[PDB]
Design an enzyme around this catalytic site. Structure first.
Site, PDB file in Angstrom:
ATOM      1  N   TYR A  87      32.224  53.232  50.414  1.00  0.00           N
ATOM      2  CA  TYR A  87      32.637  54.664  50.414  1.00  0.00           C
ATOM      3  C   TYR A  87      32.051  55.326  51.655  1.00  0.00           C
ATOM      4  CZ  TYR A  87      35.485  56.331  46.479  1.00  0.00           C
ATOM      5  OH  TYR A  87      36.504  56.504  45.586  1.00  0.00           O
ATOM      6  N   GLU A 140      33.568  58.676  52.817  1.00  0.00           N
ATOM      7  CA  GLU A 140      34.097  60.055  52.954  1.00  0.00           C
ATOM      8  C   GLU A 140      33.516  60.758  54.179  1.00  0.00           C
ATOM      9  OE1 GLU A 140      35.082  61.245  48.346  1.00  0.00           O
ATOM     10  OE2 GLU A 140      33.006  61.412  49.155  1.00  0.00           O
ATOM     11  N   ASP A 184      57.552  60.436  64.554  1.00  0.00           N
ATOM     12  CA  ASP A 184      57.199  59.377  63.570  1.00  0.00           C
ATOM     13  C   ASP A 184      57.800  58.116  64.167  1.00  0.00           C
ATOM     14  OD1 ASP A 184      56.690  57.614  61.308  1.00  0.00           O
ATOM     15  OD2 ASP A 184      58.273  58.476  60.073  1.00  0.00           O
ATOM     16  N   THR A 227      52.982  54.178  60.918  1.00  0.00           N
ATOM     17  CA  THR A 227      52.463  53.026  60.149  1.00  0.00           C
ATOM     18  C   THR A 227      51.949  51.983  61.141  1.00  0.00           C
ATOM     19  OG1 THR A 227      54.620  52.021  60.116  1.00  0.00           O
ATOM     20  CG2 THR A 227      54.013  53.298  58.170  1.00  0.00           C
ATOM     21  N   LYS A 269      55.068  46.749  60.487  1.00  0.00           N
ATOM     22  CA  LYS A 269      56.373  46.606  61.203  1.00  0.00           C
ATOM     23  C   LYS A 269      56.185  46.101  62.651  1.00  0.00           C
ATOM     24  CE  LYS A 269      57.497  50.762  58.515  1.00  0.00           C
ATOM     25  NZ  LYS A 269      57.147  52.196  58.650  1.00  0.00           N
ATOM     26  N   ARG A 277      49.123  47.279  56.215  1.00  0.00           N
ATOM     27  CA  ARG A 277      49.673  48.588  55.766  1.00  0.00           C
ATOM     28  C   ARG A 277      48.551  49.645  55.814  1.00  0.00           C
ATOM     29  NH1 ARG A 277      54.811  47.904  53.909  1.00  0.00           N
ATOM     30  NH2 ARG A 277      55.399  45.739  53.455  1.00  0.00           N
TER      31      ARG A 277
HETATM   32  C1  LIG Z   1      34.192  71.737  51.448  1.00  0.00           C
HETATM   33  C2  LIG Z   1      33.440  70.454  51.822  1.00  0.00           C
HETATM   34  C3  LIG Z   1      34.489  69.333  51.915  1.00  0.00           C
HETATM   35  C4  LIG Z   1      32.875  70.651  53.170  1.00  0.00           C
HETATM   36  O1  LIG Z   1      31.989  71.824  53.154  1.00  0.00           O
HETATM   37  C5  LIG Z   1      32.589  72.941  53.626  1.00  0.00           C
HETATM   38  O2  LIG Z   1      33.493  72.905  54.449  1.00  0.00           O
HETATM   39  C6  LIG Z   1      32.071  74.253  53.002  1.00  0.00           C
HETATM   40  C7  LIG Z   1      32.621  75.439  53.803  1.00  0.00           C
HETATM   41  C8  LIG Z   1      31.634  75.749  54.941  1.00  0.00           C
HETATM   42  O3  LIG Z   1      31.046  74.804  55.525  1.00  0.00           O
HETATM   43  O4  LIG Z   1      31.497  76.957  55.241  1.00  0.00           O
HETATM   44  C9  LIG Z   1      32.156  69.425  53.598  1.00  0.00           C
HETATM   45  C10 LIG Z   1      30.851  69.245  52.835  1.00  0.00           C
HETATM   46  C11 LIG Z   1      30.951  69.295  51.245  1.00  0.00           C
HETATM   47  C12 LIG Z   1      29.717  70.121  50.783  1.00  0.00           C
HETATM   48  C13 LIG Z   1      32.258  70.206  50.774  1.00  0.00           C
HETATM   49  C14 LIG Z   1      32.872  69.784  49.421  1.00  0.00           C
HETATM   50  C15 LIG Z   1      32.954  68.300  49.315  1.00  0.00           C
HETATM   51  C16 LIG Z   1      31.570  67.758  49.133  1.00  0.00           C
HETATM   52  C17 LIG Z   1      30.721  68.625  48.139  1.00  0.00           C
HETATM   53  C18 LIG Z   1      30.953  67.759  50.538  1.00  0.00           C
HETATM   54  C19 LIG Z   1      29.722  67.013  50.432  1.00  0.00           C
HETATM   55  O5  LIG Z   1      28.773  67.203  51.197  1.00  0.00           O
HETATM   56  C20 LIG Z   1      29.545  65.975  49.476  1.00  0.00           C
HETATM   57  C21 LIG Z   1      30.511  65.563  48.534  1.00  0.00           C
HETATM   58  C22 LIG Z   1      30.225  64.546  47.514  1.00  0.00           C
HETATM   59  C23 LIG Z   1      31.358  63.407  47.267  1.00  0.00           C
HETATM   60  C24 LIG Z   1      31.439  62.865  45.725  1.00  0.00           C
HETATM   61  C25 LIG Z   1      32.516  63.583  44.874  1.00  0.00           C
HETATM   62  C26 LIG Z   1      31.890  61.381  45.552  1.00  0.00           C
HETATM   63  O6  LIG Z   1      32.433  60.823  46.515  1.00  0.00           O
HETATM   64  O7  LIG Z   1      31.800  60.859  44.410  1.00  0.00           O
HETATM   65  C27 LIG Z   1      30.035  62.956  45.179  1.00  0.00           C
HETATM   66  C28 LIG Z   1      29.612  64.369  44.947  1.00  0.00           C
HETATM   67  C29 LIG Z   1      29.875  65.311  46.210  1.00  0.00           C
HETATM   68  C30 LIG Z   1      28.593  66.183  46.343  1.00  0.00           C
HETATM   69  C31 LIG Z   1      31.077  66.159  45.891  1.00  0.00           C
HETATM   70  C32 LIG Z   1      32.162  66.448  46.992  1.00  0.00           C
HETATM   71  C33 LIG Z   1      31.713  66.273  48.519  1.00  0.00           C
HETATM   72  C34 LIG Z   1      32.749  65.469  49.381  1.00  0.00           C
END
Ligand SMILES: CC1(C)[C@@H](OC(=O)CCC(=O)O)CC[C@@]2(C)[C@@H]1CC[C@]1(C)[C@@H]2C(=O)C=C2[C@@H]3C[C@@](C)(C(=O)O)CC[C@]3(C)CC[C@]21C
Ligand SMILES: CC1(C)[C@@H](OC(=O)CCC(=O)O)CC[C@@]2(C)[C@@H]1CC[C@]1(C)[C@@H]2C(=O)C=C2[C@@H]3C[C@@](C)(C(=O)O)CC[C@]3(C)CC[C@]21C
Lengths: 463, 462
Positions: free
Chosen positions: B54, B56, B209, B235, B238, B244
């Site tokens: 993971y 993200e 695209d 993509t 192809k 993919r």
């Molecule tokens: C809005 C956003 C995307 C952005 O923050 C901003 O843009 C705020 C606006 C600003 O900055 O003014 C980036 C930082 C963030 C604070 C938030 C919400 C998404 C979380 C909270 C971000 C973060 O750090 C950590 C996670 C984790 C992933 C997760 C769910 C898992 O993967 O299981 C585990 C729990 C947890 C904590 C929940 C969701 C996110 C992705």
């Protein structure tokens, strides 16, 4: 002259070194990210197969693209193993195996069942909800769920079972949402609540259970199924299911219920709607490799072995929990009844962002976690720890007892550095530059890695 | 239980099916411009421990620890992508996270438009793909037509070529915020410089695209949309012959200034497109797909693959020439790219009969609406591509026998079509008739053993 039967080792040494560094980092690390697992070798062999090359737009019965002779049977196999994995009745349940991942699986359900701007409720993001359930900041729509639809969050009640089912019912009668989501990331307690399905049945909402985090537990009957109460279920095929990264949508089928006059028993309308949202509307060609790997995993999960695993996962979670209380931590209301544990670190004197960065540097990977009192924004007062990843490396209760002694040295190195630092990158910098701390971290890193390296690891040996 | 057991050992049922699909692929002739056989290197990455991670966020901006290695793989994929197409890191970015083709498109719409904002995507029959925008006359079909407001095509019917006139008229009317230069079934080049006028006129956004032509463009054989377009999606399968996955390329940095304004006037695509992919639409990336994608982008950033793209066009040209000398009429008059759209209307043969006959003969091409068409379950033309077989080392000569093989298909069809009633009654007659079912098996064996000898990418046995 290029054949494309060459090995990655021979054709792309750059990429082969990097696969290999990732493999080493997993074997030597203590992985406590509640949503991480190590995929079976069997599953990865399907994932990395010739099923990549087959375009099969449509669904098994008749899916007109062309040669799909064999993939049709893989999809049906995956369907059957899916319904077997969680409790049978193909008379009463269908499944779609084509979602690319979890977020797509949710956006599919919204798209199939709701109109743009229709109203959705999920547990707020900070209180432990998923992004895909809806999240708006003060001045920004953030989730696409909050853009294409209208989301209101149901908050957590600070200290109890947390999911205020009260405030939910109050606000879900004022907001009149047409679908409520039951699912969490950061929550140590049971839900997929028959009481969600009352609050829903009341205000004429749909109940969607997103069980991505606990799916393995459910798969195994070591916790109670949302599939008794919920009408739609979504999950990822990774996390506690321990498959390749893919998604699933389960939906009720046949006759819903009967009603006034001779009857004319009312039929369910999900099946065709969810299948049209997935293939024509949102997704193009399914990833037959993922589907196959998903099929391998789902069979693994319908077995004695997997029931033992998921029992060990709860006992491992309880162990790590009991162990942290023993040294007086504080767990977000209480302990746990699932795969994970939320530690509150303000009553021990450290935030999450420091604890996470300290554990990062000693090969312990957890995530910081907002505690009810959302100052939030990269400095929340909690830490989220899970047992599934390591439980797959054959860890037992004593192994987690010891994981927690290592976290203790981490928390304790933190406190110390928190007593000579200016909060932000004056903390993070101090961990790199300070000769006394840089060494105290290396010594702890080396003990974790020796500890970690000894346990077996699903997958191939070298990639 | 270790989780190190082999798939042969733990799931024979699945191992048999992997193996039958392997049989099936190496056996037949694939002429679907949208299909290709992936390298072993690429699959080695796709089926790696990267599946387990993971991550993200974006490299540098992660929300988890322990991404030290995945950061580098993502940046490597980034670099290989900008190099692959040739592209100055000053003036272009890429996002490598999209799970597939449809997501990459929806992500651009979401980053750049408000819900119900206006999209001009070449209609489904005039080129197509659902994700450009498609409503029936009863219902919204594509989610792009649900969340956004889509108005179709602009081609000069019969003349396969793109009405750069009635488009510009209607793009001055309907006033769309984004037009999609891209195609499913179109054998010609899209004037991107003239799109950029139609778009610079309407103050619209230009999106290409280039899913089927993606290889060609990196390979420098065709002119790249990346001179005229602001945003490009693809993509990674192809023409690119990868796993993919999906990519989104976008302009960044300064966009020139007016005289007194000073010089401040920078592009705003990057942050918005990246935010539409991660918090907004997608959860965690598939780091395995990104890795596999990276393998393919290099496998392709190279001398070897400029002579793939050179052979792809000349393979296409060859096929085109050898159907003007037989097969039927050429919707467009010819090809200038990876495919040819042959008409079977002046040959007296539907697009759906001709598709289903070649299916029973292990040759898979496409049914394709042609301008002289009825819109019923079957009617249209035939879409051929060189990428698939070009991968099994086929040259211009390979593409004269493949065309003579299709001739036997076309010709057992016409015969069937003169002793059968509707399509339902046609496709029955292919299965039932002992006289035709054996005539077909004998053609299937000739195409089978023509290919089955040829090499195929992959693991031999999956
Ligand atoms: C809005 C956003 C995307 C952005 O923050 C901003 O843009 C705020 C606006 C600003 O900055 O003014 C980036 C930082 C963030 C604070 C938030 C919400 C998404 C979380 C909270 C971000 C973060 O750090 C950590 C996670 C984790 C992933 C997760 C769910 C898992 O993967 O299981 C585990 C729990 C947890 C904590 C929940 C969701 C996110 C992705
Ligand atoms: C008449 C309608 C508008 C209608 O017809 C119904 O389905 C009625 C069912 C109902 O009553 O619900 C709804 C959907 C549809 C059946 C057709 C349009 C043409 C196809 C057939 C539709 C479909 O679904 C899927 C595709 C795909 C897109 C394509 C070419 C690609 O994009 O690559 C891949 C191949 C494929 C299958 C062929 C072309 C279409 C666009």
């Amino acid at each position: 002259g290029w054949t494309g039967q060459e090995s990655l080792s021979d054709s792309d040494p750059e990429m082969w070194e990097l696969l290999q560094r990732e493999k080493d980092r997993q074997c030597r690390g203590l992985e406590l990210i509640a949503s991480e697992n190590f995929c079976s070798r069997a599953a990865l062999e399907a994932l990395g197969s010739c099923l990549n090359n087959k375009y099969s737009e449509g669904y098994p019965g008749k899916r007109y693209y062309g040669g799909a002779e064999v993939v049709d049977e893989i999809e049906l196999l995956c369907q059957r193993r899916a319904l077997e994995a969680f409790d049978l009745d193909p008379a009463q349940w269908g499944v779609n195996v084509q979602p690319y991942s979890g977020s797509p699986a949710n956006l599919a359900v919204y798209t199939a069942l709701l109109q743009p701007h229709d109203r959705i409720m999920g547990l707020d993001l900070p209180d432990g909800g998923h992004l895909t359930h809806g999240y708006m900041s003060d001045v920004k729509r953030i989730s696409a769920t909050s853009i294409f639809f209208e989301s209101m969050p149901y908050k957590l009640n600070p200290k109890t079972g947390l999911i205020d089912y009260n405030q939910l019912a109050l606000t879900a009668r004022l907001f009149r949402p047409r679908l409520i989501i039951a699912g969490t990331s950061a929550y140590a307690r049971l839900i997929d609540y028959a009481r969600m399905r009352e609050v829903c049945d009341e205000v004429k909402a749909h109940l969607l259970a997103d069980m991505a985090h606990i799916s393995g537990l459910v798969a195994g009957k070591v916790i109670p199924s949302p599939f008794k109460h919920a009408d739609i279920v979504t999950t990822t095929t990774h996390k506690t299911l321990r498959g390749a990264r893919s998604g699933l949508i389960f939906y009720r089928k046949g006759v819903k219920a009967v009603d006034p006059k001779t009857g004319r028993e009312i039929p369910y309308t999900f099946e065709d709607r969810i299948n049209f949202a997935v293939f024509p509307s949102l997704q193009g060609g399914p990833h037959n490799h993922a589907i196959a790997a998903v099929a391998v995993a789902l069979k693994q999960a319908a077995t004695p072995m997997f029931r033992e695993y998921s029992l060990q996962v709860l006992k491992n979670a309880r162990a790590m929990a009991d162990a942290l209380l023993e040294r007086g931590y504080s767990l977000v209301s209480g302990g746990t009844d699932n795969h994970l544990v939320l530690v509150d670190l303000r009553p021990k004197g450290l935030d999450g962002a420091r604890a996470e960065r300290v554990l990062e540097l000693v090969s312990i990977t957890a995530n910081k976690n907002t505690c009810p009192g959302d100052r939030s924004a990269i400095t929340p007062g909690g830490l989220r720890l899970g047992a599934p990843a390591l439980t797959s490396r054959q860890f037992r209760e004593d192994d987690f007892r010891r994981v927690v002694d290592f976290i203790d040295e981490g928390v304790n190195i933190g406190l110390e550095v928190k007593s000579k630092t200016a909060k932000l990158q004056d903390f993070k910098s101090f961990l790199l530059k300070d000769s006394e701390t840089s060494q105290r971290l290396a010594n702890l890193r080396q003990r974790v890695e020796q500890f970690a390296r000894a346990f077996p690891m699903p997958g191939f040996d070298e990639h």
